[PDB]
Amino acid sequence: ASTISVKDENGTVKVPKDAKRIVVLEYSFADALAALDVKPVGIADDGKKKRIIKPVREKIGDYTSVGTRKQPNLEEISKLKPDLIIADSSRHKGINKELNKIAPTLSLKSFDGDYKQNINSFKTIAKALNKEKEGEKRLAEHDKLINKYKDEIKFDRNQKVLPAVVAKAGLLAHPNYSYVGQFLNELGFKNALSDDVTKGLSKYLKGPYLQLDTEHLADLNPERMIIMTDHAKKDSAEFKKLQEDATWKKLNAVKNNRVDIVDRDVWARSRGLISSEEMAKELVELSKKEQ
């Protein structure tokens, strides 16, 4: 019974050459398999089918939920009798021993990976499935599309951008080395959170993100903000108090109509080829709206 050796975040994994039925524990891995014409048999979808971005969700069709990404249901994983499990190298360290009793398990970056690392995980998945050629073709198409959208995005790249989610009193900002920050850099944007800026705000770190109160937002005063919220809504209680705040109203991005509220599932959680294409496409559209 022969195998393909690949490297994951824990070292070598021997993936059976007959691996066809695969459980995935992050959204990006579901996107990877859909791109390769493989339908996962189980997905940790948080009990929320709509968190799987629509084109991916529609290509995959029916699957079995294995619960939350934080705490996947190992009983449900075991019941599926998968050939292979694809787990997140940050979220799933604690369950790794248990997963490997169920099936060969790949531990790959998603949750703590940037844009290029999530691309690296896709390549590892393609190799593991004996679909290296198909993966190369798909990535060439992806890169061509991203570059086409880059060229179609009309925004002035000298307007520095702050990507963030809403938290506490202020914003929880994604710095320049995050998934979203790096993807914005790939599209030619300049992150307002430069290395020096982030260094001078580091006492505000909460894990990899920076907690910015309105005082610190005012000091940074980015020309442009991209605010990722559930359902791309702007009327949540947290966001409301922020939007009604006096320092908020004086911000350059606010005064000049350069704050865009975008979908958190697509922009922050998906981390796939389709979702990044959609994020770039959305920036094109936003840039072409009446000035």
Ligand SMILES: O=C(O)C[C@@](O)(CC(=O)NCCC[C@@H](NC(=O)C[C@@](O)(CC(=O)O)C(=O)O)C(=O)O)C(=O)O
């Ligand atoms: O989930 C992702 O893949 C990406 C990302 O974590 C990126 C991000 O910016 N996170 C900031 C979260 C701050 C927010 N917390 C939550 O909502 C919890 C959680 O994040 C948990 C999870 O993921 O285990 C959740 O999704 O339910 C709070 O307490 O204010 C995200 O959720 O956007």
Ligand SMILES: [Fe+3]
């Ligand atoms: Fe999250």
